Amino acid sequence: LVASLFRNFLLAERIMRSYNCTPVSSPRLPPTYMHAMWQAWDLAVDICL
Amino acid sequence: EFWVMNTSIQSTIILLIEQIVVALGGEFKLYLPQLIPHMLRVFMHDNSPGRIVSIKLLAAIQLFGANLDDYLHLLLPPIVKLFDAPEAPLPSRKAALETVDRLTESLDFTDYASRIIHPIVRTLDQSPELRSTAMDTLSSLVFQLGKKYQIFIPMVNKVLVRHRINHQRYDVLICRIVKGYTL
Amino acid sequence: QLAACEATELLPMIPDLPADLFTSCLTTPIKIALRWFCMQKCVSLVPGVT
Amino acid sequence: KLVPERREIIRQIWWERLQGCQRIVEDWQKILMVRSLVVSPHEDMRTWLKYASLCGKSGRLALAHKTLVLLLGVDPSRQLDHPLPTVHPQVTYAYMKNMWKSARKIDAFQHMQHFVQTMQQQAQHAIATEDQQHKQELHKLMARCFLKLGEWQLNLQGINESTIPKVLQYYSAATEHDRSWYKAWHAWA
């Protein structure tokens, strides 16, 4: 469950950024919003819909 | 409608943008591209005494934050063209360096490593006056890039030894990259 | 701990996102991931996707 | 020769392109020769037939024959005995209208009857449901055969008493096989 939450939290960090929020986590993660594997997702989704 | 190339109105309109951005926050991203054509037209040419119009607009751009994401590739070139060009009056030039420093805290610069780094390196050589300022831009840019900076280390080092330049912040981070452990 | 927002900040009020934004990301990622895809300027180059 | 996807496209264009062009044999020969750099005639059938036809309407019936006997794959000038092969059916049909135009007229007719006896067998027996486009074009052929049979039969015997039941049995069978086609109705009328 924790693993599922943190996986998904990475998505939150990426989205909520674009609306002037920043999420926070107690084990403090590094910033992952710019990480290039997101632009893979973007393409993957694009094709797949 | 009421943007023109005249110090008179431009000052006030820019102060308006400043208050809109902080009002809408994330929402401003939509209305940004209607305004970019005017912004780029300000830097490109400006008759303002000491280029202070463009300083205020730099000071506006400082506040865009994550809004500026999709339009950084438009807006980063003319910013760079201030801090490289010999003619430009020192105050404006400083603001442009300090602007890139602000934007580093809330955008990604990995695409524009080469666009930013080479002019910083150039500025370090030509003008000795901005050597502190430009180092504090570069230091933060390195901080944001991380080990993506490893290419540039030597190239930059060759101006850092030439003029004997010392920043805690820079030296720390380079040594920290080569050994591999950032905070 | 996991927290939607920083101590300064206020959550978005934006009509097309849900008010549950941090929960929805945390526990229905694909549903908002797709909806958020649709709200970007990225969709300019995927015509016929509403 | 480079692009292996643009090929079907290019042949279609090569076809369309050609039909604007003027209908004189040397011009077509040149233009065809050019395409012969990378397309065998066992591929662009519907130009080579149309090429043969052009020779026929300009009186180079030997030249035309040469083209068709190339397409058929085996010779029916040499064997005046055996049946004309049907495996390239539109081609065979083209051989006979050439054949008639060069005055083996009684023998052209004679073969054409075998053609439709064999071709309608290739419908009613060999129609398994999947080949129903094949039989569609084959019907628009059969009606082109049947209609020729009538038209010819008059130029052979004449219009009197005995011939008329036959020719009407033909045209009416044409108009049955190709419902929509103008000339079948205009004939029958």
Add this chain to the structure above:
Amino acid sequence: LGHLVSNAPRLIRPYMEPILKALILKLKDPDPDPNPGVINNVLATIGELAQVSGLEMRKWVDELFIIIMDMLQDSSLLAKRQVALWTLGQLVAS
């Protein structure tokens, strides 16, 4: 964009409509006349975009054809006709 189309065709063939609209809409505007090179390099791209697409870009050919042939006559939208004729050739080829 010219280069990106020609060089990486697999990427572009899905995003043909968007690119092509954005390109056509440059040619339709009245105030990109102060630079000739926008119109030239837009046409050059349509040439390469045509090359890649092939039949996929059939329905758009009539639209472009009017635009291009209107440019060929009356060189006020003064593209080097070299480029316009080249593109025209490319459309009809593809």
